[PDB]
Design an enzyme around this catalytic site. Structure first.
Site, PDB file in Angstrom:
ATOM      1  N   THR A 196      10.564 -13.277  -2.493  1.00  0.00           N
ATOM      2  CA  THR A 196       9.185 -13.459  -2.063  1.00  0.00           C
ATOM      3  C   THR A 196       8.194 -12.521  -2.730  1.00  0.00           C
ATOM      4  O   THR A 196       6.984 -12.735  -2.658  1.00  0.00           O
ATOM      5  CB  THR A 196       9.088 -13.345  -0.531  1.00  0.00           C
ATOM      6  OG1 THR A 196       9.848 -12.213  -0.081  1.00  0.00           O
ATOM      7  CG2 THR A 196       9.627 -14.623   0.118  1.00  0.00           C
ATOM      8  N   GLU A 197       8.711 -11.489  -3.391  1.00  0.00           N
ATOM      9  CA  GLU A 197       7.877 -10.545  -4.122  1.00  0.00           C
ATOM     10  C   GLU A 197       8.626  -9.838  -5.243  1.00  0.00           C
ATOM     11  O   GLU A 197       9.755  -9.367  -5.062  1.00  0.00           O
ATOM     12  CB  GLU A 197       7.264  -9.495  -3.187  1.00  0.00           C
ATOM     13  CG  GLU A 197       5.968  -9.921  -2.529  1.00  0.00           C
ATOM     14  CD  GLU A 197       5.351  -8.815  -1.705  1.00  0.00           C
ATOM     15  OE1 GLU A 197       5.383  -7.657  -2.167  1.00  0.00           O
ATOM     16  OE2 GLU A 197       4.815  -9.095  -0.612  1.00  0.00           O
ATOM     17  N   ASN A 198       7.978  -9.789  -6.404  1.00  0.00           N
ATOM     18  CA  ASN A 198       8.503  -9.122  -7.582  1.00  0.00           C
ATOM     19  C   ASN A 198       7.391  -9.059  -8.624  1.00  0.00           C
ATOM     20  O   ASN A 198       6.860 -10.080  -9.062  1.00  0.00           O
ATOM     21  CB  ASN A 198       9.707  -9.864  -8.167  1.00  0.00           C
ATOM     22  CG  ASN A 198      10.230  -9.195  -9.427  1.00  0.00           C
ATOM     23  OD1 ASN A 198      10.708  -8.067  -9.385  1.00  0.00           O
ATOM     24  ND2 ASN A 198      10.120  -9.876 -10.555  1.00  0.00           N
TER      25      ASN A 198
ATOM     26  N   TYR B 125      11.163  -4.453  -6.283  1.00  0.00           N
ATOM     27  CA  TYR B 125      10.351  -3.823  -7.315  1.00  0.00           C
ATOM     28  C   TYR B 125      11.135  -2.819  -8.151  1.00  0.00           C
ATOM     29  O   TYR B 125      10.980  -2.763  -9.370  1.00  0.00           O
ATOM     30  CB  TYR B 125       9.161  -3.123  -6.661  1.00  0.00           C
ATOM     31  CG  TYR B 125       8.137  -4.088  -6.121  1.00  0.00           C
ATOM     32  CD1 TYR B 125       7.183  -4.664  -6.964  1.00  0.00           C
ATOM     33  CD2 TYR B 125       8.145  -4.461  -4.780  1.00  0.00           C
ATOM     34  CE1 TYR B 125       6.264  -5.584  -6.485  1.00  0.00           C
ATOM     35  CE2 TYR B 125       7.231  -5.382  -4.290  1.00  0.00           C
ATOM     36  CZ  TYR B 125       6.294  -5.938  -5.151  1.00  0.00           C
ATOM     37  OH  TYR B 125       5.397  -6.853  -4.683  1.00  0.00           O
TER      38      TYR B 125
END
Lengths: 481, 481, 481, 481
Positions: free
Chosen positions: A385-387, A321
């Site tokens: 896997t997350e952004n 992030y």
């Protein structure tokens, strides 16, 4: 400016933040459920006051969101399963052999077919069947599914957060502070592997385990359960979570020969000019400690080599992030506010970078640098896997999306085996202690009516997914905001 | 636009926030001292990381600040005495008779001359003599002194905050959660009354007791010790503090026939249009509960009348900074952020009012309304014992000072017996968990050199003190900022 | 941290911006008067729409402002005289010998006693007598007066701004574009010298002449008359103003042997790292050209030496407010917005410096650097004739005042002959095209009632004037805001 | 929520702001070309300093932009033709009969076939052929083209702006101040009608003529040529432009029986509560004066009825961006800054509305109210020929686009004959005196490389164009930002 043929593009979600929303789908049996409904936590401002039962309602609307996803070009999704929905009641009594070394470490947990058949008797079939139903609805469309076993909430029979805060860990079901959580998690892992093993292409034992123990026992003002400030408790929880992962890995492999990995929260660390290499050690001690152990079986200045923990990272999930910037060498680098996660909502960092509604600095280059460094450190396949970004007005998401997808391309183009990019959330959801005020969706959700609305960033996503890369016509957004 | 002849004008201070600063003057024996030096509290961000030992150093510079005060026209000062500096060791063993009613309430504590002589043997003479020395230096100038016995810190032998948080109140010296604190406070009060009784013109048992239990047991993100979230603990502490006051009052009166009161933190409550009178009850339950009991011997919807608590408020000290605005009637009015104390640092409220560095809305009218309401409620003499603004640039203090002094004039001009106005701090100081970043002084202090610098607001203060009112030439500042 | 015994401390003012305000004191006979009342200029936004007749009314309130000044410690004031109030009608016919060199330069203007007696017949006695009256009221208090002859407005018979814009300079009374203005200004100078010579301790021929021609013929969006864009016109006006000064100097000296100088607007120029010395030439061509000519009789790369212009700068008045920053060498350095005068109202510069209501960056160091450089360049006595800040809330003035007074002290302490510091305006006034929205006073003025209100900065000024320096107690304000 | 079958959707452009960019395509023969290259205008800040030759280069890239447009669903485009590219040399000598009434009004201009054949001999064939080529490329795709004859720049042989400013209108080719401009424009109109008449479906004589004379002769700080402040000059230019339109209409009709209208700049006027109807007159005098004359042949309180001007508005092009808010009745309503066009870049209006990079308040409702009012006033077919927002980050355009398209739908749904919506610019362009810093494109243009990049708003546009309406999935953007 295109990714390989089978490059995975999509988004991630978690059970707790999306499932509830339509009456009758609540999961009142987890520590997080009780925690966010707690009067004292609310009055104190530890939790926002918003309720998960007022969420997007994926538990009932899954089919409609899957269609939306497909309409936007999503070819792969990463989801989880709530331990507490599967086992509302204690699984403590299903004995199972447990091997312990000389130091008390749980080096092995044997869950055989009989144990599984027994666990299947305790399991909540309605939930198990409903999970298979939701995920089968996505997979049978000819799409990929990545299944994560743990995304924070713990069953109340294992963790009573309120009681841990009032009485102390020693006088309450203390969650990860209870080593038996390792054994129970291992039993839970085997059962899911055996029950839902055909669905996913890959497994993940847990999601950002570090956030669980850092927030729950250190950064207590963040509103995470049990909010029990104790560095000693943090290390203990971290230790058992590392074991829980290793044991879960062994037990999944017994029923599924598919890749088993771990999703982790990585901030991109940074500092002064040329202060020193004392930072590297710093990073090894706080940022890379955990993934070092589950892969190499050891960490910095600590000869210890644990075979039961090493070689248990087939692939690494990367949740990125923003960054964290430090100052000074000495023996104690210090965090500089105004940078990365320490910015003001909607503000601008000292480096002229825009900041999200969460006050997190947009810094796409960090993802690029993070990926290269991770690969050189672990040499394992990586998947973002997350952004994503908290931005209700969608004033940053479009550029934020193209920027980070670019950093991923740049890494892949240079040989780094990044197998896919999963955006954080297709839709807005319950942002834990922060409630609904933090919107990460590419698709806005009116939590009153439960209707989904496309934000322009969603359109940009479709272009990228459809082109399996960044079309020339969108190259300008690889810049900033 | 002038106050009566003997109207008190000056400022207030506390031991903890001003005394230390010069090596050797620290008081390492209080819960607050340990609390702000705690590694975990610091890492968690509960406390700023700044240390009281780096404060203004009044313990050594008292004479110079008294001269500064006098140069500015200060004719009256309100100060405190640290319980822990006077009694570093436990006073538990000095028996003393304790009368308890049927419900366990400590309705009476008898501390006679022998007990006092005994307490005087346990007391830290160096500290006692140094207090008399500092305060005599001010009084012998022909100025008035108001002495407050308690301004938050508790002796470690009575309160171990860190242990309370880790183990729970029942497994640690729990401060105000320990009813014996009532007895010990009463003994401490008699001793100070007997030892320093000639110095002050009026007494105050404690400073903003409500902030102590609300911050320590409810609004735990505020960084106040012991940071143990529990409404049950808050009520218990409040209960014992109310008793401690009543008992301290009885024991001060035994050695000093001077007026004995209490300094309290009053926010000016406000709400919607004409929602209801359900608010009045709300105010009686949260804002006026405590001062109601120590004066009337009872509160809202609670017949209970306690004679041992009533009639123990000779005068009321009013600490005013801003307001609190609510919404909805139902049975639960709710706080509206963006108003009063819930504004952003340096921002502007929805009512076009400037906000302090603390993010507190400047709202002088509230003081006016507060004073009238307090007098109609209690009919007791009032003294604005605290009023100021966090403002390092002095961009608000000049107008903030004239505004509130005006509200007080307006009240006095209308017959309300407000006997004086004390500005919060002549100099900057240690703002508790917030550290030094919050500057309330009329005089800026370079904590590195300990030098005092006059802010323009200090000059404005002198004009007011000298004119014993607001000169025509400064009437324009009775407005806003 | 104190200035020499006879160091001058006070403020400056101009006729146009302060005189009118009370009915009957208007001066409708100047170009500026017509210019700001013009419907077209107003509609176009060239002028604010505010009127000088609504000003502070010094023409009638002089005695009260002088008392205010004295109450604040002002020991010296610099004022002007309106050419148009003295000579409402044309003085063109009073012949007078005029010597012209080969190039048409007016190297000499002879105004003898008969000419003066004649001019005295044309002069407006009521105005002349009223000036003597106002300034005698200040001087007879045992205070110093510095008299400036020209502060922008020109008589309509000499300059019809509206007609110059519509028809062109060649078809209208073109002010400084008419070389005869030199002769007329010389006659005006001799007359004032002869009539009011006993009042001042020093003379100034004009105030910021460069602003007159730069604003009037180059930066036309600034709303200065005649707003006729032409670099050719600018140079012509500059040329005649330089001559007007030299001739005025000669004629003042004939009736007054007192020091005769010039007040000038100096911005502190600055640029990149170590780009080049091409900047020095740049500065010589735009910043120091004018004062070079009136002192050395020549400028950069221009052998020309004019004896009739040289040696006519007994002292130099320095008007300092902020800086100007440039970039690039090549042959054309360029202005960087966001710095000095090019900042946003109330904003912050890239260097973390606060900006005034005018959007001018607070930069006290510039005054220090400016003074040293001026002295090394000219070696003449210097007086800060103007320094202040547009700040209606007085959020910057206090610090701005102490900062710049410090820079002056620092310069004097190092031997630079700076003879005094005059703050721009004791009271708010008419800020030319900007109207009343720009407040520079130490004292606020309600233009409706005409009442004066002390801003805290005024109190700070008194401390400085009284201490004839910066007391230790105010040393912290030598920093920033 | 869909428009009629043949509803026109697309965008508008102008020659000057888009054509140049690639070397060799400049048009150095217009007043605007000289004006923006002028050293004095640049130094004065009247013009930005940016050059049109560094623009998007449509003159060379037309085919690529047409494809982009088509890819986005654009079915209709409105373009112009530069008078100066067609007739670089004076057309004054082509005699042509000119009928003049008693007051000097040019009531008729007769341009017959011989005159046209003659004009065709003077015309620049390369330019004429290139226009037919560019527009034929769009039309032959089966798309609609609306051709506008005048979009501000005037040939230098007709208007020398620099000379007008220096010498005055009477000593220079004064553009629209020269009534012969009427005759020349009429000749130009007949020629274009005869030469390119087959291309467009509708004609427009001119674009926002009111901006030309208001900016050029009143709001001179805006940097429009000739920057000659004079209300008298403004009325004269307006008068001749009204005649030029009427005459152009007559001559177009002679060679083309297609609809001939006018594109106009309409701000939505607004005021206090219920102040008066004095506003209506105000609006008729400033806002609706021009379109009233070219349709009714007269205006407010002015019996005069001119038949040669009436009935010359077959359709009305509406350029809408924001509003203007006034105060007070008396006889002079006044503009309130902070509203509509008078807001700050990126700020928020007193009504909580976001403001563009130009500092123009987003106010979609105004378009709705404007359309109804125009139809009731004129009853003619309407086409939103311009609507967009300066927003380089595309933080407002997506919502701005859906909002206004909605206002148009709402109007059409209620029977108002709005025949289409043209967004202002597909791509960024040269924003006149403001240069390139004002970006209105749906598509971003890197003026260095000339590459086009799709902003997310472009994607939203495609959805609207394709759906010929606002899909349910985008209904949320009919709100605000």
């Amino acid at each position: 400016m295109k990714f390989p043929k089978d490059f995975m593009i999509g988004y991630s979600s978690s059970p707790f933040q999306f499932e509830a929303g339509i009456p009758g789908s609540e999961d009142p049996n987890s520590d997080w459920w009780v925690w966010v409904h707690d009067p004292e936590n609310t009055a104190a401002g530890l939790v926002s006051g918003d309720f998960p039962e007022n969420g997007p309602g994926y538990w009932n609307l899954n089919q409609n969101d899957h269609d939306l996803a497909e309409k936007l070009g999503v070819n792969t999704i990463r989801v989880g399963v709530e331990w507490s929905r599967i086992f509302p009641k204690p699984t403590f009594n299903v004995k199972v052999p447990v091997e312990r070394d000389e130091n008390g470490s749980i080096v092995h947990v044997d869950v055989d077919d009989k144990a599984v058949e027994r666990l299947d008797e305790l399991a909540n079939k309605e939930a198990v069947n409903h999970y298979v139903e939701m995920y089968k609805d996505w997979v049978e469309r000819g799409r990929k599914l990545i299944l994560n076993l743990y995304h924070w909430p713990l069953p109340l029979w294992l963790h009573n957060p309120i009681m841990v805060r009032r009485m102390g860990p020693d006088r309450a079901p203390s969650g990860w502070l209870n080593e038996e959580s390792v054994v129970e998690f291992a039993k839970y892992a085997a059962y899911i592997a055996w029950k839902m093993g055909e669905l996913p292409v890959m497994w993940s034992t847990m999601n950002e385990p570090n956030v669980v123990y850092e927030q729950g026992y250190m950064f207590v003002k963040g509103g995470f359960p049990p909010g029990y400030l104790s560095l000693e408790a943090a290390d203990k929880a971290r230790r058992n979570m590392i074991q829980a992962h290793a044991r879960a890995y062994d037990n999944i492999k017994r029923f599924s020969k598919k890749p088993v990995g771990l999703i982790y929260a990585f901030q991109w660390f940074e500092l002064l000019e040329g202060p020193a290499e004392v930072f590297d050690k710093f990073k090894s001690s706080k940022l890379y400690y955990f993934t070092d152990i589950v892969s190499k079986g050891s960490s910095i200045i600590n000869v210890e080599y644990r075979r039961d923990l090493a070689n248990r990272l087939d692939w690494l999930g990367v949740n990125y992030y923003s960054r964290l910037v430090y100052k000074i060498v000495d023996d104690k680098p210090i965090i500089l506010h105004g940078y990365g996660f320490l910015c003001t909502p909607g503000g601008i960092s000292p480096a002229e970078n825009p900041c999200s509604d969460f006050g997190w600095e947009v810094y796409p280059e960090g993802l690029y640098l993070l990926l290269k460094e991770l690969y050189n450190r672990y040499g394992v396949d990586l998947i973002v896997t997350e952004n994503g970004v908290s931005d209700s007005r969608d004033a940053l998401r479009p550029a934020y999306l193209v920027s980070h997808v670019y950093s991923v391309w740049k890494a892949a183009n240079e040989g780094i085996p990044v197998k896919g990019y999963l955006h954080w959330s297709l839709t807005d959801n319950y942002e834990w202690a922060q409630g609904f005020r933090q919107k990460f969706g590419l698709v806005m959700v009116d939590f009153k009516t439960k209707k989904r609305y496309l934000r322009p960033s969603a359109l940009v996503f479709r272009e990228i997914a459809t082109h399996n890369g960044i079309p020339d016509e969108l190259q300008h957004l690889t810049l900033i905001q």
